[PDB]
Amino acid sequence: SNAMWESKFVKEGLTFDDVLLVPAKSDVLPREVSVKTVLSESLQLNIPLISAGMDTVTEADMAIAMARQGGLGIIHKNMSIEQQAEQVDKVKRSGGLLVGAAVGVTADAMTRIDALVKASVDAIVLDTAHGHSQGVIDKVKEVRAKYPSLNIIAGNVATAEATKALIEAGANVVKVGIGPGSICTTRVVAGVGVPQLTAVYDCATEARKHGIPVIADGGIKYSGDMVKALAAGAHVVMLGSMFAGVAESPGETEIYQGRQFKVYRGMGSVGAMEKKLVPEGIEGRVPYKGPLADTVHQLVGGLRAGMGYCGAQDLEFLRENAQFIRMSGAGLLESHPHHVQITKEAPNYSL
Amino acid sequence: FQSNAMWESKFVKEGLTFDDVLLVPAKSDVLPREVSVKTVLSESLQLNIPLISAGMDTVTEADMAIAMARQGGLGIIHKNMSIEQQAEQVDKVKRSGGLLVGAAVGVTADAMTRIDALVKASVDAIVLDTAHGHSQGVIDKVKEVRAKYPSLNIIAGNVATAEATKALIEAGANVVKVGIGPGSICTTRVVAGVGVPQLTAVYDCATEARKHGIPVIADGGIKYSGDMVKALAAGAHVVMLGSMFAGVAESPGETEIYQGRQFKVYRGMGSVGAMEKGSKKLVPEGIEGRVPYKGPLADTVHQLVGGLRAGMGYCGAQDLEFLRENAQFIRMSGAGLLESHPHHVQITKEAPNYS
Amino acid sequence: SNAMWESKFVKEGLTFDDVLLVPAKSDVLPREVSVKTVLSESLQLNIPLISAGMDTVTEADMAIAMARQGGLGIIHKNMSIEQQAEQVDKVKRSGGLLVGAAVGVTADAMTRIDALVKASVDAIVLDTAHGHSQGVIDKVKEVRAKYPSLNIIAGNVATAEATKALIEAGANVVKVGIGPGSICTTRVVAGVGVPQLTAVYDCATEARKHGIPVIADGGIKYSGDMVKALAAGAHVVMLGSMFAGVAESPGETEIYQGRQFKVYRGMGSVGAMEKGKKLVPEGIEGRVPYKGPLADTVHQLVGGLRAGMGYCGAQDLEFLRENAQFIRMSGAGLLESHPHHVQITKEAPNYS
Amino acid sequence: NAMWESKFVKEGLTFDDVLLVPAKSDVLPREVSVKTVLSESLQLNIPLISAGMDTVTEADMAIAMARQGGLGIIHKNMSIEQQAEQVDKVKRSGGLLVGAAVGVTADAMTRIDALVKASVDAIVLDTAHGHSQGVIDKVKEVRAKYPSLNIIAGNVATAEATKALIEAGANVVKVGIGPGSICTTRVVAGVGVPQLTAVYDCATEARKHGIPVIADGGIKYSGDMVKALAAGAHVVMLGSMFAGVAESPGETEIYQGRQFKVYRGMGSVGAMEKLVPEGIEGRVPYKGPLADTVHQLVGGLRAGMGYCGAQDLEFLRENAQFIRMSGAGLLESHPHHVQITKEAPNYS
Numbered sequence A: 001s002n003a004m005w006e007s008k009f010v011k012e013g014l015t016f017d018d019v020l021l022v023p024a025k026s027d028v029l030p031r032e033v034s035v036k037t038v039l040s041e042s043l044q045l046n047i048p049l050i051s052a053g054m055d056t057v058t059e060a061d062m063a064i065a066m067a068r069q070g071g072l073g074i075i076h077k078n079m080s081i082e083q084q085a086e087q088v089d090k091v092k093r094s095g096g097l098l099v100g101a102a103v104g105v106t107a108d109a110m111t112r113i114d115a116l117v118k119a120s121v122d123a124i125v126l127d128t129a130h131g132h133s134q135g136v137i138d139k140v141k142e143v144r145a146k147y148p149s150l151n152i153i154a155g156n157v158a159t160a161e162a163t164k165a166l167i168e169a170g171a172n173v174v175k176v177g178i179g180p181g182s183i184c185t186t187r188v189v190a191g192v193g194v195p196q197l198t199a200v201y202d203c204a205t206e207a208r209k210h211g212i213p214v215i216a217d218g219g220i221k222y223s224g225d226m227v228k229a230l231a232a233g234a235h236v237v238m239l240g241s242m243f244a245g246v247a248e249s250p251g252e253t254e255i256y257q258g259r260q261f262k263v264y265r266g267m268g269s270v271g272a273m274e275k276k277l278v279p280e281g282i283e284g285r286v287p288y289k290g291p292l293a294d295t296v297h298q299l300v301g302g303l304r305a306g307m308g309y310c311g312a313q314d315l316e317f318l319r320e321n322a323q324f325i326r327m328s329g330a331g332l333l334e335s336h337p338h339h340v341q342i343t344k345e346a347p348n349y350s351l
Numbered sequence B: 001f002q003s004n005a006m007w008e009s010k011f012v013k014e015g016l017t018f019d020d021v022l023l024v025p026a027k028s029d030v031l032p033r034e035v036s037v038k039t040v041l042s043e044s045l046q047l048n049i050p051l052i053s054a055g056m057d058t059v060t061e062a063d064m065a066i067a068m069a070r071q072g073g074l075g076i077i078h079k080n081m082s083i084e085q086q087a088e089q090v091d092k093v094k095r096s097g098g099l100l101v102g103a104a105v106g107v108t109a110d111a112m113t114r115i116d117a118l119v120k121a122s123v124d125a126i127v128l129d130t131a132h133g134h135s136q137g138v139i140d141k142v143k144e145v146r147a148k149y150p151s152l153n154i155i156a157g158n159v160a161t162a163e164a165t166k167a168l169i170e171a172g173a174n175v176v177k178v179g180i181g182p183g184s185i186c187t188t189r190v191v192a193g194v195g196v197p198q199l200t201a202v203y204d205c206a207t208e209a210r211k212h213g214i215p216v217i218a219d220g221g222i223k224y225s226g227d228m229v230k231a232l233a234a235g236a237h238v239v240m241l242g243s244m245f246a247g248v249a250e251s252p253g254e255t256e257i258y259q260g261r262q263f264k265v266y267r268g269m270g271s272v273g274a275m276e277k278g279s280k281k282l283v284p285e286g287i288e289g290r291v292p293y294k295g296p297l298a299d300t301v302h303q304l305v306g307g308l309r310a311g312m313g314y315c316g317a318q319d320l321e322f323l324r325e326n327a328q329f330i331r332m333s334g335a336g337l338l339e340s341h342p343h344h345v346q347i348t349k350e351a352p353n354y355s
Numbered sequence C: 001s002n003a004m005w006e007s008k009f010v011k012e013g014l015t016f017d018d019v020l021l022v023p024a025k026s027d028v029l030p031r032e033v034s035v036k037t038v039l040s041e042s043l044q045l046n047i048p049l050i051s052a053g054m055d056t057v058t059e060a061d062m063a064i065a066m067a068r069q070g071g072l073g074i075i076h077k078n079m080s081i082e083q084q085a086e087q088v089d090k091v092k093r094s095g096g097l098l099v100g101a102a103v104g105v106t107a108d109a110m111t112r113i114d115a116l117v118k119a120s121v122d123a124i125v126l127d128t129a130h131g132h133s134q135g136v137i138d139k140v141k142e143v144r145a146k147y148p149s150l151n152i153i154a155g156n157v158a159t160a161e162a163t164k165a166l167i168e169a170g171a172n173v174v175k176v177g178i179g180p181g182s183i184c185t186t187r188v189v190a191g192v193g194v195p196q197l198t199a200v201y202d203c204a205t206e207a208r209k210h211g212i213p214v215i216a217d218g219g220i221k222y223s224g225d226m227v228k229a230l231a232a233g234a235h236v237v238m239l240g241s242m243f244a245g246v247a248e249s250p251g252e253t254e255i256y257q258g259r260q261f262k263v264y265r266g267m268g269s270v271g272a273m274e275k276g277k278k279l280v281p282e283g284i285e286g287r288v289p290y291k292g293p294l295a296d297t298v299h300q301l302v303g304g305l306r307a308g309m310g311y312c313g314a315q316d317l318e319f320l321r322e323n324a325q326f327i328r329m330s331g332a333g334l335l336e337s338h339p340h341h342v343q344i345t346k347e348a349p350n351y352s
Numbered sequence D: 001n002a003m004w005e006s007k008f009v010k011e012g013l014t015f016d017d018v019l020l021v022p023a024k025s026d027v028l029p030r031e032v033s034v035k036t037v038l039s040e041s042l043q044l045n046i047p048l049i050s051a052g053m054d055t056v057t058e059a060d061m062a063i064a065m066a067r068q069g070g071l072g073i074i075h076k077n078m079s080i081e082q083q084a085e086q087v088d089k090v091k092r093s094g095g096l097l098v099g100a101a102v103g104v105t106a107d108a109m110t111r112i113d114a115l116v117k118a119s120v121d122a123i124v125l126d127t128a129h130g131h132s133q134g135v136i137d138k139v140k141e142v143r144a145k146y147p148s149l150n151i152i153a154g155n156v157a158t159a160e161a162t163k164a165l166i167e168a169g170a171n172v173v174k175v176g177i178g179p180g181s182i183c184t185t186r187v188v189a190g191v192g193v194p195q196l197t198a199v200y201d202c203a204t205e206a207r208k209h210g211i212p213v214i215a216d217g218g219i220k221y222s223g224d225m226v227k228a229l230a231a232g233a234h235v236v237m238l239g240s241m242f243a244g245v246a247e248s249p250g251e252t253e254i255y256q257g258r259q260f261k262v263y264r265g266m267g268s269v270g271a272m273e274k275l276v277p278e279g280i281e282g283r284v285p286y287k288g289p290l291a292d293t294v295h296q297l298v299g300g301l302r303a304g305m306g307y308c309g310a311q312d313l314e315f316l317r318e319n320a321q322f323i324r325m326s327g328a329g330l331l332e333s334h335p336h337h338v339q340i341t342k343e344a345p346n347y348s
């Protein structure tokens, strides 16, 4: 059987910069469109934005800000169970907001989940590097079996086989993304990954047939990518780098060459793990952006504008009807502003 | 439930831009100086050259519109001013020598009031400028202007699809403007993620517009004279330039020394600065910047036309109709683009038509 | 007939940096291969390369050294009729070596050629921006009629139909290249051109039916490009930028930031056209690093060809033209092809 | 006129063109097997071979490589006496596996004799063009004299060359024409085949004869090695990623507060000391002891095989799938839009 040998290089992948959204007939202004989205009856959002579960991205103050903006925050797991449980309770006491918490496939996973459920968390996030693993699937089964009503976000995966496997396991929402992270080196050190736009589209295609929403995680640098991700089949996107510079992100502002910066690093980086192994991430920094409200406004505003061009009144019409168009690298250069000295920065370009 | 066929066509379309192709040479019986660059937009509108200056606050006002018209082209006076002022600019150009002049109009409730003054100032064409030309507000506005002014030249845009062009034409538009996101100072494709590669956009719109005997305008993306030849060869009747005109003397704005030499301010109309003056929080779709000073407009126009004449000479095109209907392209890679530009040599002197 | 409108973006073109020559079975060592080429009964070269007819590339001194290496030189036409016919004879009297001279499509074209024939050139180059035009077509007919046995090299062209046109006009050698020049902007200011390698392959395809040789003109920056051009069907290549740093080339040495340089400019540049706000140039002017004698540069070029032919197993250029295969690669391949992830300490005699 | 129309048909791929597609896994990365068997006389515990160059592999490197489960190839830019001594030096350092480079020359068989007497485990017939009649005749000459000897001949990049070379009597085929970090062969000769395609085309032919192949050149990250192995290679050979370690020949030089070591191609002017070089000369960063580089290399392999659901290198060789991407894909694959503060032990 040469089926496997003769099909090693057949597949093709696309990402955000390979593609443009084709404008269609619009009977709706950007301010008129609806950006609401539903993961489940117990989990509904006013904006399709979820902050990443990372030690440099989301804690108590970040989750409260995201929820009050209409989004969701996933509290990272690089803390004790008691700490994460009382961080969830802190967010819930802050006005009955929505909040999530990250959990890993370990031995104390169910022990941590108990406290999170005891803290009345809305959704736990089973975060692993390879979501198509047997341990992950088996772990999801244990959770659903004990908590039939609890929202379970399982990831990360990048194929249809993996999405189906987790859906049958019992996951309500499937997080998609192997490699596209701004601080990720998984595709560099392991040589493993799938281009994000193709990944989201492939995983959605399977998940769309189960009534299962998918999360576009990592890879988004501009507002336009979020629109591309949602139109590719995603119900909601997850951001790390664009939320790291935000004031409400966990961290103290440092100074580099006079400017204000915030520490942003991978969970698979050396620094994050220590708090010798082979890292699948790096340690870096992003400019301080101020309050979250300004970043959200630029992001959501870009989505509204994008939905307006496609004639999409709401997010579902976008997924069902939006058409992309492929372009070369030369098209990307035309897409970006070109051949002009940039006097000053825009609040949506670069960040 | 549903059975979606649109789902499997999400990534089937692919688009080309200027740096993706080259014009293939052909048998030629005409010298570059012998060719014709004249075009017809409508019965009442005719240009000797395929150049139109963009309706931007940093590109086209009276002095620009006058200079452009005297070169054989057309100038679209921007709408970032009062209705009276705009009508005054249109009058100033019309009086100068019976020169042609255009005016930019947005889809507002003030639109008809603005157009009334423009027509009274004897404007030759109005441009219905909007980020999304395939919109109801635009289409409905075209109907309303065509009804009240049955003989007024209406330029409608911007669109990037064939269905949109067809929609504008049936709304009563004389000319269709094509270009979503290729602008030098544009970030629409970056902040909204929406667009079509300009050469593909121009070509597809021209395919639909051909059916109705309607001309189209290639707007944005042009950074060299060769790009203009491609746009016209793609099927466009006329090109619209913003960045190559902004550094010209007649353009609005004073000169400023940056990086050791003279520069002129050039910004996108969807940028912060270009809208905070006509506002009294937004998400911009353009940036603010500056382009190098290039002196009188005549020098720029001569380079553009000359490059067009050479390109038409390589193709054997005695006129622009033969160019649109006969010219062939050839798709190349990024490696082909590097070969096309000068390479492996330190350029010591600045060329009139390069960098 | 909506065919012409629908067949607008069908064609795809390849340049040198899109392909690699696939190695083949070899029973011949690189030093054993034959690099000799036959353009005509009267024009035979030991090595397959010609110095371009430009005012910063080829005059008498360059033409002589080029011919002593087994190549050919084309005296540029940026000089009076007397000046060109003069230093053509200057080459013709430094041995029995060969020499060429560029001629334009003017009202006094025939007058210049007559002086060159009296100076006894081996080949004239009817050179123009657009070879596929009646002005050039009827000019070749004129020369071919007056001089039945004169080697006529017409160009430039980039399509098979154009190559066919020049051959039937009277040209026995066709020069290929519309815009791949290093000092060229024709592609940028006119939007016109064909990716050189595909241009050579298309032109050679048609020209081969008539037994007519093809010159791969322009677009060569490394010796590997030459091997690809010859393998693409070309008999001989023509160089400009690689011959300008050579001492024998016209112009004097300029020093920039501690290094020696020599002026290299396009014949369509503003500087070239001024000598002989007006016109629109299709070329630029600049400088290239001084290389020294022609012998050193020409040794690295042929050496690359000999190695390249050895990999493909070609004993002579004919076997290379008839059998050598390519393989396309993306931008990721091109970067792998060049040195990478290693900080170069010294310049190599044949790399950058 | 079929050979004329065939010229521009083929398409090639390299490491930066694709990504490995993650598959269902029941295995942890630390549990996977990275052992490999080239021949019954030559078995490696890790799929890493130190390249036979004068800036990469000598006695000190070959010993350190062998103790990690890898292999070292002593370069032949030295006398027959010296190379045989280096071979004997590694062998008397605990009976470690050693390899030695041999070229196609007059003193070829003479050199091989001295290496055989020094009990070399494998000889590498290292040539620029493996598909030449000279190398083929040389392999035939060597195999006839030493039936039980391991012969690694190269380099090739086609299935034709691999077949003709296996028929010559070689046990291992080394693949790679031009992918080298210090190589200019594709630039100066215009000849080459994209490594990942070359490995695939060669391994396709080779496995029909049950013959292993070496992926030689082009690797800049551990992920590339995983790709090379998943393309059909039994084992890879590294130059630049080893030239900076402490066990490599050459001493640390210093430039602007960062340590470097010399690394140049064997086809460069320096290593060949008019000559027409097919390589350049330069320097790579100093990376301390070999065990740190190797740890990252293998650890990255285990991660890859983990994602692919591969329990051993044979599974990865027969089942792993690739997905093709553009330049934008590669941009997304590497970190982006974030100013890297400190360097990872496995990333630049």
Ligand SMILES: C/C(=N\O)c1cccc(C(C)(C)NC(=O)Nc2ccc(Cl)c(C(N)=O)c2)c1
Residues within 6 Å of the ligand: A128, A129, A130, A133, A179, A186, A267, A268, A269, A277, A278, A279, A280, A281, D025, D027, D028, D029, D302, D303, D304, D306, D307
């Ligand atoms: C998100 C992420 N990678 O994408 C990450 C986060 C923390 C640690 C790590 C580390 C431990 C460095 N990498 C890691 O666990 N990789 C890995 C690779 C392959 C498999 Cl099969 C597994 C696994 N345990 O399933 C894990 C990775």
Ligand SMILES: C/C(=N\O)c1cccc(C(C)(C)NC(=O)Nc2ccc(Cl)c(C(N)=O)c2)c1
Residues within 6 Å of the ligand: A026, A028, A029, A030, A304, A305, A306, A308, A309, B130, B131, B132, B133, B135, B188, B269, B270, B271, B275, B283, B284, B285
């Ligand atoms: C020309 C241009 N964009 O190309 C532009 C000009 C001024 C403001 C703007 C701003 C206000 C920033 N954006 C804007 O009008 N966006 C937009 C997006 C989508 C739609 Cl459907 C619409 C619309 N109302 O047609 C407008 C854009």
Ligand SMILES: C/C(=N\O)c1cccc(C(C)(C)NC(=O)Nc2ccc(Cl)c(C(N)=O)c2)c1
Residues within 6 Å of the ligand: B028, B030, B031, B032, B309, B310, B311, B313, B314, C128, C129, C130, C133, C179, C184, C186, C267, C268, C269, C280, C281, C282, C283
């Ligand atoms: C080689 C080359 N251009 O690529 C060149 C050389 C000298 C002058 C020129 C100038 C005069 C600047 N350009 C030029 O003659 N271009 C040109 C363009 C199109 C045609 Cl159809 C013609 C022509 N007369 O055939 C010439 C160009």
Ligand SMILES: C/C(=N\O)c1cccc(C(C)(C)NC(=O)Nc2ccc(Cl)c(C(N)=O)c2)c1
Residues within 6 Å of the ligand: C026, C028, C029, C030, C306, C307, C308, C310, C311, D127, D128, D129, D130, D132, D178, D185, D266, D267, D268, D276, D277, D278, D279
């Ligand atoms: C490894 C390598 N090239 O990849 C190399 C090593 C040393 C010298 C050389 C030199 C001498 C510079 N080149 C070389 O042998 N080239 C070459 C080219 C073509 C052939 Cl057919 C041959 C050959 N005789 O096999 C050799 C190359």
Ligand SMILES: O=c1[nH]cnc2c1ncn2[C@@H]1O[C@H](COP(=O)(O)O)[C@@H](O)[C@H]1O
Residues within 6 Å of the ligand: A052, A053, A054, A156, A177, A179, A180, A181, A182, A183, A184, A185, A186, A217, A218, A219, A220, A238, A239, A240, A241, A242, A265, A266, A267, A268, A269, A280, A281, A282
């Ligand atoms: O250390 C890492 N290695 C690989 N992926 C990571 C790592 N840390 C975070 N990620 C992923 O990348 C996402 C953020 O990527 P970003 O949106 O490009 O900033 C996170 O939500 C995770 O899914």
Ligand SMILES: O=c1[nH]cnc2c1ncn2[C@@H]1O[C@H](COP(=O)(O)O)[C@@H](O)[C@H]1O
Residues within 6 Å of the ligand: B054, B055, B056, B158, B179, B181, B182, B183, B184, B185, B186, B187, B188, B219, B220, B221, B222, B223, B240, B241, B242, B243, B244, B267, B268, B269, B270, B271, B285, B286, B287
């Ligand atoms: O701010 C903006 N955002 C997006 N497009 C713009 C903006 N302002 C002007 N444009 C378009 O871009 C064109 C100029 O493109 P350019 O000639 O390539 O500089 C104008 O004629 C408009 O069609």
Ligand SMILES: O=c1[nH]cnc2c1ncn2[C@@H]1O[C@H](COP(=O)(O)O)[C@@H](O)[C@H]1O
Residues within 6 Å of the ligand: C052, C053, C054, C156, C177, C179, C180, C181, C182, C183, C184, C185, C186, C217, C218, C219, C220, C238, C239, C240, C241, C242, C265, C266, C267, C268, C269, C282, C283, C284
């Ligand atoms: O100014 C010019 N414009 C366009 N092509 C030129 C010009 N000058 C020289 N060329 C062509 O470019 C060739 C040199 O290309 P190079 O070898 O890549 O430097 C010449 O032999 C001519 O065919």
Ligand SMILES: O=c1[nH]cnc2c1ncn2[C@@H]1O[C@H](COP(=O)(O)O)[C@@H](O)[C@H]1O
Residues within 6 Å of the ligand: D051, D052, D053, D155, D176, D178, D179, D180, D181, D182, D183, D184, D185, D216, D217, D218, D219, D237, D238, D239, D240, D241, D264, D265, D266, D267, D268, D278, D279, D280
């Ligand atoms: O100078 C040379 N010219 C061409 N290839 C070379 C030369 N020197 C070494 N190589 C090859 O390149 C490999 C190293 O490439 P790297 O692993 O990418 O550094 C070696 O193992 C050889 O196969």
